Structures are given as C-alpha cells and as structure tokens.
C-alpha cells in the first residue's frame, strides 16, 4: 500500500535514471534507481525482482513493473523510525551528533563494558566524512547497511 506521495518518489527517481526517455529501465538502471533512493539490492538479489515478470525484451522493467515490485520488501518494513529514535538515544547531549564519549557511555548502562580502544574504533568505522563524529545520516547507513 504505497502512499501516493510514496509514488512521487518511486517515479521522480525511477525516471531520472531512465536515460533513453521511454518508460522501462534496464537491470543496471533499476540497480541504480534503488541505490539512489537509499537501498541496495545485492548483485544477485537484484534479479529475482526483475526476473519474475519477463514480459519485456527479457531484461527490462517499466513504471508499473517497478511500483508493483516495491512491496516484496516494502509492505512490511517500518524500521526506519526505530533507528531514528535509537539515534536520539545515544546522541545524549542533543547536538545531532554521536560522540565516542556517549557511545561508550550509553553502551555501558545498557550493560556493555567497552574498551576505550574499541569505541574510538566504532565511531571511526561509522564515520564517512571524517569529522570524528557520527550524524544521523552515517548512523542510518551503518545500522541498516547489511
């Protein structure tokens, strides 16, 4: 049951990468359409979706072909929120960032004795832009990024 608004996107994005301007996107394109939207199906998990409906040049998928396939894994998932709440939780001080200090802090109350060496560690691998701290964006990345 994707909300209408949930279509605006799944198209405003679907189309942006439809180079040849028609209404069907190649495999690699679907791959891109999605990633751009914030996901990434695996190299092989990417086929099962496009594969089930071969009513094309045995390789492409149209607009509906798409919208109707964004259910298989989108008519259940509501985790997005939880994770945004988990964030506000560690971001103890409300700066919008999660500092190695608080990570280790909230980590222990929740019961985990973390080594000063393996916290300045997580915070690092989680940090993508190099500013020593993890914002909501990098957090969400780290979290869901399977």
């Amino acid at each position: 049951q994707l909300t209408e608004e949930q279509i605006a996107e799944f198209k405003e994005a679907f189309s942006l990468f439809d180079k040849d301007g028609d209404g069907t996107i190649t495999t690699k394109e679907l791959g891109t359409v999605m990633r751009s939207l914030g996901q990434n199906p695996t190299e092989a998990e990417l086929q099962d979706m496009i594969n089930e409906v071969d009513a094309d040049g045995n390789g492409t998928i149209d607009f509906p072909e798409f919208l109707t396939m964004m259910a298989r894994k989108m008519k259940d998932t509501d985790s997005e929120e939880e994770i945004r709440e988990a964030f506000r939780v560690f971001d103890k001080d409300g700066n919008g960032y999660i500092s190695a200090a608080e990570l280790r802090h909230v980590m222990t109350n929740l019961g985990e004795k973390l080594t000063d060496e393996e916290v300045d560690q997580m915070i690092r691998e989680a940090d993508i832009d190099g500013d020593g701290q993890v914002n909501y964006e990098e957090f969400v990345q780290m979290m869901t990024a399977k």
């Binding site: 996107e9 994005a13 190099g130 020593g132």
Partner: protein, 735 residues
Amino acid sequence: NNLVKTEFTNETLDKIQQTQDLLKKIPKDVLEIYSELGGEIYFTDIDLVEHKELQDLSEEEKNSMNSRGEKVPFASRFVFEKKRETPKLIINIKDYAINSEQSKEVYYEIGKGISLDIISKDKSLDPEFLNLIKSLSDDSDSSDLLFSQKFKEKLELNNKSIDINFIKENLTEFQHAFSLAFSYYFAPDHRTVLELYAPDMFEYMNKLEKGGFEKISESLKKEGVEKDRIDVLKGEKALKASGLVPEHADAFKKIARELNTYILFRPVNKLATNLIKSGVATKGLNVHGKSSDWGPVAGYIPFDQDLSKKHGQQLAVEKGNLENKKSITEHEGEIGKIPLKLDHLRIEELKENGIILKGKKEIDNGKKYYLLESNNQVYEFRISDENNEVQYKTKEGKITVLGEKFNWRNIEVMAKNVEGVLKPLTADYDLFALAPSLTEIKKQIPQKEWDKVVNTPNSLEKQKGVTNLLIKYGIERKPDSTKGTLSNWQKQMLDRLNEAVKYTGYTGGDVVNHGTEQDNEEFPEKDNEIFIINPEGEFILTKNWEMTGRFIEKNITGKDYLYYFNRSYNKIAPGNKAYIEWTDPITKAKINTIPTSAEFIKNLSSIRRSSNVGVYKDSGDKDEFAKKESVKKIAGYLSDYYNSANHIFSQEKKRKISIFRGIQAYNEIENVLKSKQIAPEYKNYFQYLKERITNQVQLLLTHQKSNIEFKLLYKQLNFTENETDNFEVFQKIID
C-alpha cells in the same frame, strides 16, 4: 568557572611566581567560596589607578570606611574590590617584595575577607549564635579583654552587652573584624598575633580552615542548583492540579521506584478526581463521548451529548451523540448506558464547587424528589429519594438545539463493563509518557540474546546488534486489540499501575487504559501542565510545553532514561491536522549537513506535486534533457559523499575526499542555478541545497586547517574541461 585572571604576562616568573606565592597561601576553599559568589580575582601589571578595564564608575566609593584603619586615598591603592553583585577583586604587583613588611599583603587578605564576611557566616546564614556569641567575647567569656585590633571607634563601647540588642545596627563593623581576623590568620607573617591576642576568633578561623569554609562552600554550592532550576511546583501543590486521586498518586509513587521510571500524566479533570476514588470506571478507547463541566451529570459522560461541554454546537452534539450510539452499537455488552445515581458525598461536593444547588422539594406519583437547580437555560434537573436517580426535561419555555422537547426522564451516562456490571464512565488517567531507566530495559532482554550479540567479533556489528536489541526491547511499538498502540514493557508497566491502585481500594478495574500520549500520532494534544513522578517519589507538575520539554531534556533525556517523543511532533498530524513543535536535535544539525541522494530526489519529488512542474520536463527541448542529465549528476555526487568505503581511509583523507565530493555537488548545482528556466520553486531549493553543502564543506574544513574559506577555496578550482589535476590542485590548497 576559572577564578583567577592574569592580565599582563609581562614580568617573568617574578610577577607570576608572585601571584602564585600569593594564592597558595589562601585556603583553596575560601576561593571556592569566591567562585561560587561568581567572583573572579584580577591580577594585573601596572594599573594602579582607575585604569583597569573594569575599574571605572559602577558601585564605587560611597561611605569612607576603607582599609584596616581608615584612609580613603584610593589613588595610591593596589588592591580593590568591586562590592555590589558579583565580587571582583583586583590586584596589581610591581617589583620584587611583599615579604619584608607583609603589612602590605595583609590588605590583599582582608581586602579579600570583605568578600566572605557579609556573605561568609558572619551573616549569610545569619550572624548565627556562633559569631553572635563569639563577637560577644568582647569581654565576658575568657580573661582576654583584648579586642583592641578590631573594635575601636565603633566598639570601644566596653560598656554594653553586645548580643542581639545592638549588633544588627552595624553589620559593617563586624565585617571589618572577620576580615582583619582573616588577614591576620593567613598573613604570611603575623599568625600567632591572633592566637596570643584574640583567643577565640583564632579558634573560630581555625575551625573554619579545619572545615568551615567548606561548610558554606557547600551550602552555596547546594543552593547553586536549587537556586537556578526549572520552576515546577513540586510536592503536593502539583497533586492539586494533578487531578489524580491522592491515594493513587501515592500508590504509583512506589512503582516508579522499584522499576525506576518516570511516570508522566496529562491533566485529569478535577470533577472526576473523586468519581474515581469513589469507584467509577474510566473511559477507555471504545468511548469518544465528551465529558461535562456542569449540571448533575458533570464528571460523567452523558449519553445525551447536549448535557456535556459541547452544549449548543448543534453539530459537536449532532455528531457527538452519533458517537456514543456507535460506542454501544458496536461493542455491545462491554459499552452501554445506565441511569445516573449521584451518591451522598458527590452531591455535597458539586455544591461548594458550585455546579448544583440543592433546594426546594416536590412530589410526584407519591415519591419524594429533592429539586436540583442549575443556572442553565434549557434543562431542569431533579434527583430522586428512594434510589438517588436523577432526571431532566426541556423547560416549558425552551427547546433542544436538535429540535427536541421532553418531560422528566432519567439521565443516562455511559458505562463500560466491569466484572459483568455496567459501571458508569468518567475520565481515565492518560499517560503522557513513560521514561524507564536505560538499564531497566537491559533487565528486559533475555540473558542469552543480549549474550549471543556481545560475544561477536566485529566491533561495528557489535553495535548494530546492541542498538537493534535496545530497539527491539525498548523503542519498538506494536499496535493492540485493546490497549491502543504501546510498547511491551509499557504494557507491563501499564499493568503494575492498575494492580497497584487496586490493592489500595479501587472497584472500577483499571484506571490507565492505553499507551502513552506520545503515540497518539493521530489526534495529538498539547497540554501545558504535566504531572510527573521521578523514580524516587516526588510529584512534579511542570507548567509549560517548553518547561515540560525542558524538564525532560535535563532530568530524563540527558540523565540515562530511555525517552522517545511523538512521531507526529514537528509534522502536521493527519487526524486533527495539528502542528506541535518539539526540539529535534537531528534537525538541529541539518543546517550543516550535505543532503543524501534520496533526501534530494525526495525533495524534488515533492515540489513536483506542489508547483505542478518538475525540474525537467518530458519534452524535445535539448536543454530540458541537459537539466535532467545534470540532476542525475548531483544525485550521484551526493550519493558519493556518503560512501561506506570511506572507512579504508584515514580520518584526514575522509575530510578531504569528502570536501571534494561535496564541492563537486555545489558545482553541478551552481551549474543548474545558472541554467534555463528551472522554475523558482526549484531555484529556491537549490538556493538552499547550497547553503548546506557549503556549511558541510565549511565544517569539514574547521576540523583540520581553518584559514581557508569556502568562497575562496572554490575560486581557486577549475571545473571546465579537465578535472584530473584539479583534485591534485585541491590537495595543495590545504598546506
């Protein structure tokens, strides 16, 4: 709060090592007594006269009682104290020495002492007998009538019993003392003078050094917080606007502790405060009637809507009754209507509160009826006598907004089903939120799961694993057949509350029927006052939506308690289409964060549905394409900023590598803003996406080397036909 300030780092150690040789002699705590009084000590180079950047015209010299004795020659001075709000001691030193005739440093001692007397113990707490009787040792206790060095022109009065009779009049002269007693105790030279001559003041000071200064230093420290804090009326003054049934509030007082979790409730109507203790049931989710604030029915949910708050709105009622009807029409057996029966106490209550007036009697069919009067102008009411039923009817000169008119009938209230007995309904306790100790949640995860998670290698995954656990056992919220939408522990908590107010003496079942208002995403309501109950047993009722949000930040959020705020805060809530603001830190940092591919696409996808025109049209113009191709380009650059393989790099590079990715974006943006006719709707957004990048890119700079500005750094680049060495150019731009 750093106390001492050194103005001119001009001399060598000679000056420095002199201000040190100075403070190392004053008792650390006497300083903590200063810093508390918001004081700050000022040491300077050669500023004698009114030359210091803080020695001009504020609270200067009024009445002349100045140094030890009295001299008032300011000019020549080197030590001064700005007396009026926040003490400011100012000291200058010149050449080598204070130690020959220390009779000079003494003033930096008493001159100081004038900081803590009048605020010390001499009078802050008040002159307490301690110094009130110790000052009395003028001449009566010990055989040492030696007080010549503190009592002259104001107390050469050896002929007077100095108790409370005359020590108030001149608080000042008894400061010129404590001060000279201090200067004398800590003066690097004359220490025994106050031991030989004053026999007690000495002990006095000594005790103070022994631990007295820390006394007050801790009595001003404690009133440091209790002073400036969040004005919430605590104690029982809250429980007053709380509406909760005292025995219950107190009853809850015990659960917050054991479990350790703040319980926050919304305003419970007072005209229900007793209908509860009494034994009346509470409105659950199945009922959406309106209560009443007048008449006999008041405090109950009339079945007759026109007998509630919405008395007149020919639709709140016409679509109000329409509500109760269905309430039964559907859940029959559990939700029904029963006749009103105001008991004994209740009547006497709605009395002094002024809702009804019991007066003249009447008789019909043989039964007695005391008449109940209410200054309404459409319904007349009457209770019975046998069974205290109640009845109404339209007056012989009025109608009902819907168009009805009737004779005496029994007033029907709504009533759920309690142990097979339709009990009447009044307001329920609606929880505003539940804040459990961040640890209490751990005591929620089954020892093996939390185990199988931490016994993992991957430092990164050991977090994800945890967080998800914290989420699965703490934050997650499933819906529910009966109790609204609430957490799992939230339900467990929801039980302990009800069973707790049952071993107390309640007979209407549960008094908390559904999850926390911070899930009432649909029709969220903004309550000003909010009764809270810390994990200790103190009733605190906030007073603002802010204070409330402020009290949660200070005592809950930032104090190790898991709290989560209403999903619909900051957005427009569908149902009542309402916007309720609540400080979201994530949003705080949005201003300086480069957007995400998807955050971007999304926003475009939005404006489309707004101005019915998208960034690029499906047309033949080859410029539209251009524009299209272009956004597909930014869509990348952004998506490229947030790459997970930025991890095999060094913190350093991460900033560089990303500042570029950033900049690249700011470019293709700069490219379209200077394009064909992209509507303004988009002209604006892009206008905005820039400030982001910029800020984000600026921030990534001030983390490492910050003499460089975005504007400039940009200029120096060449995004024309060759990007190759441009990055190489970028590197050298930071050295």
